[PDB]
Symmetry: D2
Subunit: 251 residues, 4 copies
């Protein structure tokens, strides 16, 4: 179904990104993984699916490393057919106590990397007469929260870059869209929850204010939506920002 397509997913050595890669892999895509830490438990996950997978450790706040990432995909599979721009970093502080380097780093990775990714993948998508760009943005690409100046700013920028790129490719078989998740049960959020108290009330205390369902989204939910955007039923979904959020945006 995606056999013969090649998906690259940024920040996919674990968490949301690996859940996404997992589903693409299952539907027959070859995989370019990206991320820090040992890339091998993850490579062996994707390969379980009867597919070739590779990993590049690009630090995506460095453009030249983004370039060597895309250069590895060109040499290894003839380029990227599905780009999932997923990697992200966070820092929580009042705007006037926000670390200056956190600002720049968050803008670089959450926003600028997505424009770099897209610019490098889009030529081959157009040439091969088919393409999918899926930016994993956030509810924070649509509304604000106190303490998240840089993240909400970057995620908004992504939502808007999505629209521009969906419009620029409207008359082709390449689509660009954004998924906007609320709370996701990630390795890092799991670790949080693990860090006295009790697991239920830590997770309730996290979700209660913003997320009316009081239940996490999972990586696998997000993976399936990606697969959806990659099907033919996704062909006239263009420049959209779809939220998966347990009611976050509804109120």
């Amino acid at each position: 179904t995606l056999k013969g397509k090649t998906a690259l997913v940024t920040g996919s050595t674990s968490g949301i990104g690996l859940g996404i890669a997992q589903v693409l892999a299952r539907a027959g895509a070859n995989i370019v993984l990206n991320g820090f830490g040992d890339p091998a438990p993850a490579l062996a996950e994707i390969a379980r699916h009867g597919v070739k997978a590779v990993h590049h450790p690009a630090d995506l706040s460095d453009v030249a490393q983004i370039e060597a990432l895309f250069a590895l995909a060109e040499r290894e599979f003839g380029g990227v057919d599905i780009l999932v721009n997923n990697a992200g970093i966070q820092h929580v502080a009042p705007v006037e106590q926000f670390p200056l380097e956190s600002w720049d780093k968050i803008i670089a990775l959450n926003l600028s990397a997505v424009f770099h990714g897209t610019r490098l993948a889009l030529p081959g998508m157009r040439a091969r007469n088919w393409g999918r760009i899926i930016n994993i943005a956030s509810v924070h690409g649509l509304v604000g929260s106190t303490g998240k100046a840089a993240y909400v700013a970057a995620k908004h920028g992504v939502v808007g870059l999505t629209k521009v790129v969906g419009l620029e490719t409207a008359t082709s078989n390449v689509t660009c869209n954004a998924i906007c998740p609320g709370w996701v049960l990630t390795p890092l959020v799991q670790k949080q929850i693990d860090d006295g108290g009790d697991p239920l009330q830590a997770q309730h205390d996290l979700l209660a204010e913003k997320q009316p369902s009081l239940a996490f989204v999972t990586p696998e939910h997000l993976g399936e939506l990606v697969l959806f955007l990659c099907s033919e039923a996704g062909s006239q979904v263009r420049g959209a920002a779809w939220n998966v959020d347990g009611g976050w945006l509804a109120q």
Copy 2:
């Protein structure tokens, strides 16, 4: 996955409703069709997927008829698991030349019918601890167009009613969402069409950047996605399928 579910799709004797009911049918749901005219051709489009289907002719502007439709589903299948609020009607006039009966019927069919359908299906979905309500709205639940006062007003109401209902069922296995299509190849659009390509572009050029139609089958596939496990925490959302309409 949908075997042993029952889906009621309003406005499903043709076009968008029928393509939706057909996708749900391929996935194995029992189907309740609704709409005007001979239900035979829609019922064969369904029954051939190896499933049970039935039909009720309810005019959805009449509240008692809405009740008769939901009565027929419960007597036939034991309840609605999946409700797709789809039927719609249009009229185009400047606001100050817009016929008053026409305002009232568009509001009744496009807006108030959704609320009635919802309030009749909800309690059963709650009791069975599972449910999907999907409102087929429009890009016109999100933006305006000239000539379309009553429709944009109704479809915006649907978007808002969708948020309320997604919030109220947030802590259950019942979800409520909307799907917001741009230009869709309907039997009524096809009739409009009749080279047919230049017709299609004349129709779509201003509003729909892809110059290509959304299909009822694209929309069925989304509905199907939303009924799946992966749509469990999609709530009160209005997802646009529109060839780039909203991106500009």
Copy 3:
């Protein structure tokens, strides 16, 4: 600055509508008032500003009554220049227990009256090539809350309607826009607080408790803030505001 203009405000015998009419009266507009109750207080308040006011008691769920209201404006002042569609009604219940009648009434007053006011004003605004229609909608025109199926639907429809009219009037000097308030300090809202206060219970705490969930400022929008916005929209700087929905809401929508 609005001298020579005529404003009609719906639901202006008291509260928000009256606060808006007062600011338009102070800017020089002649005032058509509408609503239930004794109109003597509203008419007195307006008169103070050295302007002419009249009152029509039109039930806005009755299209014939709306027509009579607008007919009064034409004979009295030569037609409406600034239409403020303000009248609102509310009811809270779960969707599945929301009474059918309340659904119809809310839809009729909060949404359909807005279409009727708008259809009746627009021809004379166009003929004079000058006009402002300002719809007082709600944050509930942009997001939901639990228990508010009919209001959120009707207010959303107002926001949609506003776009259609903004668009259809774009090439003329008539504009149509929406204002979308959060919690506004009305006499109804003052009772809520008052009732908490009578419990032995600090009024500020009570006001905090009421606003905390939805309105980060913990402070009310006032009818006067809203009248001042309406007056802005009616200025030359409002000429190219068209089909817009602007929120005044102590932060409600930013989160």
Copy 4:
């Protein structure tokens, strides 16, 4: 109405920022102007209003120079009560043909400068419990257009940033909002039009605006300054984290 308040307006040596500054000065704010080119015309327009004014040339893609700009505001006037983050830069190319250099400069100026402005003004506004930060974003902070990847990303980032700041300041007398203009009649855009060589001034404005702005009429810098001034009144006290569009119907379709 603004006597004894100090407004700083970035990019106010001409076009939109200057029109905004003029209306604020007319309302009696002291003014800190900023921008490239000869500042004397901009200074002369302010002084016709009878308020004190100074100019700083800070390049807003340089963080140290924006810090100098706020130091001058502090030294001259004791700090900034009304911050208008206006300065804007533009570049049109398909996304895969957008200069990397111009991507970084648009982000720096249209987005990151707004974070720096804000972080530098907000401690003095909180100390004095009164402030207004008003970000001049664009309809492009709400929707896309082809050719405009950087600008659309930056201005959307601004609209998001404004929400966070609105929220962080919600419990204070400091507000933060954004204004989102469509096509604005700027000196630069009059240079486009006055070059239209043989044509019809009327149907060239029309052809420029037809596609995006159904009014076929410009927002003026002066309309924008009047809304800024609104946002500065007691009536804007509970306008918080908002993004109001002034766009001749752009966002309505």
